[PDB]
């Protein structure tokens, strides 16, 4: 049996800039049951339908974003999350699953634990993971190691309050990729 429970039902989720990836080998997987969990606001599959998969490696990437950025987890998409935090390839074959987690990842006064990368020199390559914490240089002045005029820390907090609107509430995202190689299964 596949360990899909410890991906979707994990107590805590990673920040998007430091998104988690679980590898899936061996196992027997029921993707129709995953669809029929019926607790998902977003379940979009590209290149395959959920009723057809029932491979060598399956990758389950998980993280948390705000609602309006869930659309950025899609091939060919653009924006802060797609460019600086998590990028999907144009030829993506897999599924994107998202569910609202305002009950879990939000607290009165604001939950500032979830971070995203605000600034970067170039766009992320597909499936790239950047955890650098170097001060971004937005001007001619070399930042060295401090912030100030055109010198900023690269990570920002989401600030998840329970009374946020849907577009600004926490959403937990799991992305399934199906990598087949010249290998067993």
């Amino acid at each position, epitope marked *: 049996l596949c360990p899909f429970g410890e991906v979707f039902n994990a107590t805590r989720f990673a920040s998007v800039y430091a998104w988690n990836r679980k590898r899936i080998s061996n196992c027997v997987a029921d993707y129709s049951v995953l669809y029929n969990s019926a607790s998902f*606001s977003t379940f979009k599959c590209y290149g395959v339908s959920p009723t057809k998969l029932n491979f060598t490696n399956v990758y389950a990437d998980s993280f948390v974003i705000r*609602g*309006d*950025e*869930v*659309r950025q987890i899609a091939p060919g998409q653009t924006g802060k999350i797609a460019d600086y935090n998590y990028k999907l390839p144009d030829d993506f074959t897999g599924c994107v699953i998202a569910w*609202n987690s*305002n*009950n879990l990842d*939000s*607290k*009165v006064g604001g939950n500032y634990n979830y971070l995203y990368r605000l600034f970067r020199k170039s766009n992320l390559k597909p499936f790239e993971r950047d955890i650098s914490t170097e001060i971004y240089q937005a001007g001619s002045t070399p930042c060295n190691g401090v912030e100030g005029f055109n010198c900023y820390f690269p990570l920002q907090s989401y600030g998840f309050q*329970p*009374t*946020n*609107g*849907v*577009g*600004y*509430q926490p*959403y937990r995202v799991v992305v399934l990729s199906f990598e087949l190689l010249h290998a067993p299964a």
Partner: antibody, heavy 121, light 108 residues
Framework: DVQLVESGGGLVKPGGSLRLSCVASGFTFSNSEMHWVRQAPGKGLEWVSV????????HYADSVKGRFTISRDNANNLLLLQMNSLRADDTAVYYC??????????????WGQGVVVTVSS | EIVLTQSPATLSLSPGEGASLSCRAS??????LAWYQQKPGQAPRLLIYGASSRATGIPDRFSGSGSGTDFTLTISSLEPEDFAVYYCQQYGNWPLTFGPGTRLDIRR
């Protein structure tokens, strides 16, 4: 002055479709999260659906998910509810309403006049 | 799902008395608790948000209080226009839910 004016209700046979519309005026529509809330005759308020300010996030009640679609056109100050596969349960007055969190009013602030929807053969 | 129960279902009072209306959630309300008033044939009118914040223009004889799973709406001195139906509602948990409503009628 803040105003929400709804249109598009009427009679529909079971299994039919119906598109409700709400036009906003007197406030920044593009900065407003909106909801559809319905009330069956002689019953209480029941939440139907929500769409965020930009339109990129929507959520639905269980009984209408997959059958209804909420949408918005911020350029035309327009909010829409496309209802498909209607049944007798869906008979209700439908209200359009704003959730004014961006103005620190965390409740259904402004309401439309409501429009009747009857599903019957 | 946060089921909201309102007690009592009906309240018979004379004008000039006070009204106390109860809302109980089946689990903690972490978002906003709101109170609405509805008259026949009209849209609901927002009275209270955030369990205690009175909406703009609402007369100050309306107040709200509470937290967690228990909230009360208080009308200090009843006016004839106040006899209506009252709903509590929570925001923050999906689905958005309403109470079944408390009906306030004139006692005689």
């Amino acid at each position: 002055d803040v105003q929400l004016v709804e249109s598009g209700g009427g009679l529909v046979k079971p299994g039919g479709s119906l598109r409700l519309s709400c036009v906003a005026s007197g406030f920044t529509f593009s900065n407003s999260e909106m909801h559809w809330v319905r009330q069956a005759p002689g019953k209480g308020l029941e939440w139907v659906s929500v769409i965020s300010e930009s339109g990129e996030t929507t959520h639905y009640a269980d009984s209408v998910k997959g059958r209804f679609t909420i949408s918005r056109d911020n350029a035309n100050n327009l909010l829409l509810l496309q209802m498909n596969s209607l049944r007798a349960d869906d008979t209700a007055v439908y209200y359009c309403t704003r959730y004014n969190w961006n103005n620190r009013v965390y409740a259904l602030d402004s309401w439309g006049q409501g429009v009747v929807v009857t599903v019957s053969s | 799902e946060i089921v909201l129960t309102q007690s009592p279902a009906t309240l018979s009072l004379s004008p000039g008395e006070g009204a106390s209306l109860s809302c109980r959630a089946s689990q903690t309300v972490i978002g906003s608790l709101a109170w609405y008033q509805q008259k026949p044939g009209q849209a609901p009118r927002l009275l209270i948000y955030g369990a205690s914040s009175r909406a703009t223009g609402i007369p100050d004889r309306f107040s709200g209080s509470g937290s967690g799973t228990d909230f009360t709406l208080t009308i200090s001195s009843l006016e004839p226009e106040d006899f209506a139906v009252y709903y509590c509602q929570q925001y923050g948990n999906w689905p958005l839910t309403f109470g079944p409503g408390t009906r306030l009628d004139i006692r005689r």
